[PDB]
Ligand binder design. Structure first.
Ligand code: GDP
Ligand code: QWH
Ligand code: MG
Length: 167
């Protein structure tokens, strides 16, 4: 089957691990070791193609040396949390990092606004839409707690990779 190398990036605490674990195990984690970085595998049918997703759940090596495992990534989920203004403001840094590791301004990428189930919103959907439009990428809101938008964010990334290269 076809392998898709996905990388999940973003500020600590936005829900990178919870989004990955919800996608793979259909379960929401109340806590997950903030320092653990690992790649997880998931076989799934997307638009009739049997795909092997190899997802790197980053812990933030550069912020806390270069992460050698990110360089082979074909697509990136850039995650902020809708109740964490700082994580949204940090999106510029992660996008610059992705451009640097791939030496390109045309990288398959999806801006993800996680924790959409929470009522303490500080990042408006229009702020995230403006940011995603300047980068030329899709913006999707998710909840790793309720699974709302989770499959869509990962499948949209797979579709963005296909849009960029033959798979
Ligand atoms: N309510 C809610 N909490 C979430 C969601 N995603 C993550 N969290 C919580 O936010 C905290 C940090 O999540 P985690 O996945 O470890 O973040 P990471 O550092 O980006 O990997 C944990 O307590 C999670 O349960 C979500 O969509 N909704
Ligand atoms: C949420 C990410 C995080 O806490 N990462 C982290 C923290 C510390 C203290 N050290 C390292 C090496 C890392 Br990746
Ligand atoms: Mg994590």
């Amino acid at each position: 089957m076809t392998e898709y190398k996905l990388v999940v990036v973003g500020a600590c605490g936005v829900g990178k691990s919870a989004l990955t674990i919800q996608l793979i195990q259909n379960h929401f984690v109340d806590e997950y070791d903030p320092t653990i970085e690992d790649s997880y595998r998931k076989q799934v049918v997307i638009d009739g193609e049997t795909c092997l997703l190899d997802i790197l759940d980053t812990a933030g090596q550069e912020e806390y040396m270069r992460d050698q495992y990110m360089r082979t990534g074909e697509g990136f989920l850039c995650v902020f949390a809708i109740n964490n203004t700082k994580s949204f403001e940090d999106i510029h840094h992660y996008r610059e990092q992705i451009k640097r590791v791939k030496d390109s301004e045309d990288v398959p990428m999806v801006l993800v606004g996680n924790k959409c189930d929470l009522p303490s919103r500080t990042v408006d959907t229009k702020q995230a839409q403006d940011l995603a439009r300047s980068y030329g990428i899709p913006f999707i809101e998710t909840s790793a707690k309720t699974r709302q938008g989770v499959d869509d964010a990962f499948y949209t990334l797979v579709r963005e990779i296909r849009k960029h290269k033959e798979k």
